[PDB]
Design a protein around this nucleic acid. Structure first.
Ligand code: GTP
Ligand code: MG
Ligand code: MG
Lengths: 71, 97, 81, 312, 48, 97, 98, 33, 94
RNA sequence: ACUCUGGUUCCUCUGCAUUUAACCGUGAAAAUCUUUCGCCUUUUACUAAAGAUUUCCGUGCAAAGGAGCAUACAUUGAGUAAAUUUUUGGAGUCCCCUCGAAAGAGCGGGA
């Protein structure tokens, strides 16, 4: 995890510099719990917010209408 | 008791009081008739047909090849297992039509 | 037969083998156990008697009463029956 | 050619055969084998060396095995699950030696006493710690806390029961007093696992606040018992009871992580020493081999990863 | 019961609706042995 | 080279017995407690099927069919096919009186 | 213990030291008994004070003469089985990062 | 209390539904009717 | 099992065992002579057809000769040792 | 004293049903390939035998999960309940000679 030293291309956008595997992003297999996955879909769909799906989510614990999540 | 003593020497299945069921197609109702010698008066037409049925049987039993101990491919269970087939009960002449 | 304890059954399988038995008076008889009984009366053929002084005799047959036997030495193979 | 650190057949080994989320995994203290289980309810045993063949597979739980620990002499495996039951599995027989059928809800964690008479501390969704003695059907101690308890351990002398749960505070119950002698306060969210250092001086405790805090559990401490805080791992929306464990030399600490990475921290500096990739879901349980520098990690991805690490 | 579709299938004499085994009494078997007689061989042994 | 020319029954393993094999071998030293016995008679008077019972009693895993004679001692395949004992076969067993 | 039929075997196959009414001491592997307290000792030996030893064999002691017997030594002596998985070697796939 | 009281309820509901007997390993292999 | 352990007590109303029957219920000391050439003097509180007894507050005496004796608070005596039971004239009903 | 389990009926998955004299099937199809017979102006569709493989209609058992019906704790693997000659209701005790500081031991002897 030691970062790559030196400048970065002015020409490529951040989209183009990004780590990727397919033409548009890094696809990788995953194994969630089926129950909690379904719970999070339905919270986003019905309430407007869900818990953040990212690994290494950092401070961004909630996604979507975060104002409702905190309230 | 006299009847029980009679069943012991009955033709199969009647010397059995218990067993597995068979398919209706498996039970060859007439096969005992041509296994034994043709009755003394039967026409040549019939005598030849006894031999020919006997030949089929001898050819079957000669070329048996016992059945492979292998996995049971349930076609219709694989069909029942998908959204595309449903089940019901019908009169045989309705399903036939 | 009706059930009887394993020691008596093993004694009946000791028949036909050599055995040694000591009587309550102390004499040691070695012989071939030709018969046993459920009360463990014993008939020994071909017997050698040993007195407590260490002398000995051959005896052609002996019957020893069951309640006068102190212990027997059976043969080894009976542990497999 | 490259450096090698263990008798492993390869520097990393992938162990496959589980059918569900692997919640728990532990090495035998003698170092010969390891046992792993989870949502698939079977307990799989694996040799640490050679082909790592799955030489045995215990079955019997009617629920997910939430936690699983060897007794210190390695003669028995303690396991507990969502079938409200703690079971002790005899290793030579492969059989349920005891079944402590006395919890009233899911049992989240279990820990056998390190030495002396074998006692089994257990914590449960009924809110109670219980200590079960192999010789009696009835528990020796029932410590009713008000809220569901998710993690438990004895202290090294096996006379205090340390537990944590939904209230985030760790309780320490003193088994001669039947009172909480002190509490360790500092986690922001529910505790997911507690583990006791080999020397017994320290515990770590993992929590859904994404920190591991190291606590000094010695009888006398001259001041604050909070020794330090480790960070880097993450707990996701699955809210798994991510375990934690100690290196047998205490120089290193591990915790489960939802970010797929197997984290190792150095106890003294609190720096991350390893952040190994390779899992594809929550790394629920992590442990060190007791004699040799080998890492166990058990994923929600149904994979177990064994591998060497340079424990310098 | 002689002319049911799967006779005795629901009774104690056969295992159940899968219709895999049967176990009759001698009154049953002897009545059936009589009714079959037009189809059966007279031979009592294989020596023929 | 794989000429399966088998002409007699052969057992890959020793079958289980009620007696230990070591007790049989040790009884060999004692001729008081052994007998050498012929079994004789007319054809099909039940000799081999009688030995099948002693086999079944002394060998817990010995299988007798419900509807055919095992004929353990008819080891030759021609004896299997002809249905009669053709060559004498010995059987040594330990049995209780 | 012994003859309590759920625990009939309570000392069977232990090495036991048997004292008879004549003062003899036998020692052997106690491996059968009878309702008359007859006992059968495998690999039996006798012992006397001076300690003098003699080898006997498989000894049957008529129960009438037994004073008492005691445990002398243990019986002789010599995670189960199964498995489903496999454990081929492998390596760690690098995931994405922020 | 009441904040922990709500979290105590949530954990009870989530764990019960997650580890429900009706969802344990092998179940939901539904029979066609 | 226990049926013939309960039916036993009929004959003791009249047989020679009556000296034990009176010794219990009227509480007479009895000087039970035994094998080992020892005397036991005590109050029988139970007995049976085989002549077991339980003895309270026992004095044991013998010659060893010089006289020696021992005091035993309670005892069970296996009846095969009992030679001769005597209602002791050196004691009484109590 | 330990852990071990509710009956039935049905569905579906998985595994096994080779030491075949012979038989998962007390019944009995079709194909391919190789070869040999007979039709035949060719091929297909065929005749009728051999050998080698396939497919198809079926079979058994074990184990796991589920679904319906009416409902019962025992019970499996591990392991409970006779004072009359031959054993478990006493032919038991006591006393001399011998070797040896010491305590036993002689088919020792005596009441
Ligand atoms: N009724 C009846 N038939 C029996 C009995 N035992 C044998 N059989 C039949 O008699 C026939 C001969 O039995 P085997 O055992 O072959 O007799 P065998 O004497 O050994 O025949 P060989 O040795 O060749 O002379 C078979 O058909 C058996 O089924 C019996 O006990 N009762
Ligand atoms: Mg024969
Ligand atoms: Mg052309």
């Amino acid at each position: 995890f030691k970062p790559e030293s030196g400048p970065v291309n002015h020409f490529k956008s951040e989209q183009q510099r990004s780590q990727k595997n397919t033409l548009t992003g890094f696809v990788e297999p995953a194994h969630l719990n089926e129950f909690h996955f379904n719970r999070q879909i339905r919270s986003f769909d019905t309430l407007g917010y869900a818990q953040n799906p990212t690994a290494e989510s950092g401070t961004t614990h909630f996604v979507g209408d975060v104002k409702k999540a905190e309230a | 008791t006299a009847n029980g003593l009679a069943l012991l020497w009955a033709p199969r299945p009647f010397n059995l009081r218990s067993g597995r069921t068979r398919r209706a197609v498996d039970v060859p109702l007439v096969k005992s008739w041509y296994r034994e010698h043709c009755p003394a008066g039967m026409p040549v037409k019939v005598r030849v047909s006894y031999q020919k049925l006997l030949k089929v049987f001898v050819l079957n039993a000669l070329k048996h090849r016992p059945p492979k101990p292998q996995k049971r491919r349930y076609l219709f269970r694989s069909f029942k297992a998908t959204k595309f087939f449903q089940t019901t009960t019908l009169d045989w002449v309705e399903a036939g039509l | 037969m009706t059930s009887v304890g394993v020691p008596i059954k093993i004694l009946h399988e000791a028949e036909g083998h050599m055995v040694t038995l000591e009587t309550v008076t102390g004499e040691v008889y070695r012989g071939k156990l030709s018969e046993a009984e459920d009360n463990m009366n014993c008939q020994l053929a071909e017997t050698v008697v040993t007195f407590r002084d260490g002398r000995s005799h051959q005896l052609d047959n002996v019957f020893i009463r069951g309640n006068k036997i102190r212990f027997m030495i059976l043969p080894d193979m009976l542990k497999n029956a | 050619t490259a450096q090698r650190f263990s008798n492993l057949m390869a520097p990393t080994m992938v162990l496959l055969g589980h059918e569900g989320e692997i919640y728990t995994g532990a090495f035998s203290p003698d170092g010969t084998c390891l046992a792993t289980s989870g949502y698939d309810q079977k307990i799989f045993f694996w040799n640490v060396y050679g082909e790592c063949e799955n030489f045995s597979t215990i079955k019997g739980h009617s629920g997910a095995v939430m936690d699983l620990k060897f007794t210190t002499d390695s003669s028995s495996l303690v396991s507990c699950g969502t079938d409200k039951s703690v079971r002790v599995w005899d290793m030579e027989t492969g059989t349920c030696a005891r079944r402590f059928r006395t919890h009233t809800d899911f049992v989240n964690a279990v820990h056998p006493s390190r030495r002396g008479v074998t006692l089994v501390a257990s914590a449960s969704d009924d809110g109670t710690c219980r200590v079960h003695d192999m010789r009696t059907k009835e528990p020796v101690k029932t410590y009713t806390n008000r809220y569901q308890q998710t993690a438990v351990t004895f202290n090294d002398s096996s006379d205090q029961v340390i537990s944590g749960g939904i209230d985030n505070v760790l309780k320490v119950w003193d088994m001669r007093r039947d009172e909480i002698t002190y509490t360790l306060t500092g986690h922001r969210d529910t505790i997911t696992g507690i583990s006791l250092s080999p020397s017994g001086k320290f515990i770590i405790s993992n929590s859904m606040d994404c920190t591991v805090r190291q606590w000094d559990i010695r009888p006398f401490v001259p001041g604050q018992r909070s020794v330090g805080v480790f960070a880097g791992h993450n707990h996701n929306f699955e809210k798994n009871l991510l375990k934690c464990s100690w290196s047998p030399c205490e120089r290193f600490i591990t915790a489960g992580s939802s970010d797929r990475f197997l984290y190792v921290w150095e106890t003294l500096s609190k720096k991350i020493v390893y952040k190994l990739p390779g899992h594809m879901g929550s790394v629920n349980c992590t442990d060190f081999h007791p004699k040799e520098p080998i890492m166990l990690s058990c994923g929600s991805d149904k994979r177990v990863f064994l591998g060497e690490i340079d424990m310098s | 019961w002689f002319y049911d579709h799967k006779p005795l299938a629901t009774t104690r004499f056969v295992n159940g609706p899968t219709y895999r085994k049967w176990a009759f009494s001698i009154p049953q078997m002897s009545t059936l042995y009589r009714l079959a007689n037009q189809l059966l061989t007279d031979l009592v042994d294989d020596n023929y | 080279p794989v000429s399966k020319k088998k002409f007699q029954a052969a057992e890959r393993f020793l079958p289980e017995t009620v007696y230990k094999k070591e007790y049989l071998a040790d009884l060999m030293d004692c001729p008081h407690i052994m007998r050498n016995v012929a079994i004789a008679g007319h054809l099909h008077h039940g000799k081999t099927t009688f030995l099948d019972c002693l086999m079944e009693q002394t060998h817990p895993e010995f299988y007798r069919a419900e509807d055919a004679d095992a004929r353990f001692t008819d080891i030759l395949f021609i004896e299997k096919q002809r249905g009669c004992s053709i060559k004498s076969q010995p059987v040594s067993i330990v049995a209780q009186d | 213990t012994i003859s309590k039929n759920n625990k009939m075997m309570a000392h069977l196959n232990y090495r036991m030291k048997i004292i008879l009414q004549d003062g003899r001491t036998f020692i052997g592997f106690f491996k059968a008994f009878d309702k008359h307290m007859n006992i059968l000792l495998a690999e039996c030996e006798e012992h006397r004070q001076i300690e003098e030893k003699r080898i006997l064999g498989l000894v049957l002691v008529r129960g009438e003469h037994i004073v008492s017997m005691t445990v002398d030594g243990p019986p002789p002596r010599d995670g189960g089985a199964g498995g489903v998985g496999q454990a081929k070697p492998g390596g760690r796939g690098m995931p994405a990062m922020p | 209390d009441s904040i922990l009281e709500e979290k105590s309820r949530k954990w009870k509901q989530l764990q019960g539904k997650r580890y429900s007997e009706k969802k344990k390993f092998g179940m939901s292999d539904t029979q066609k009717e | 099992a226990e049926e013939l352990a309960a039916k036993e007590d009929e004959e003791f109303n009249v047989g020679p065992l009556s000296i034990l029957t009176n010794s219990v219920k009227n509480n007479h000391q009895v000087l039970i002579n035994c094998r080992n050439n020892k005397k036991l003097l005590g109050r029988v509180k139970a007995f049976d057809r085989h002549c077991n007894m339980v003895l309270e507050n026992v004095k044991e005496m013998w010659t060893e000769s010089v006289a020696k004796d021992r005091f035993i608070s309670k005892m069970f005596l296996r009846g095969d040792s009992v030679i001769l039971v005597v209602k002791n004239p050196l004691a009484q009903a109590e």
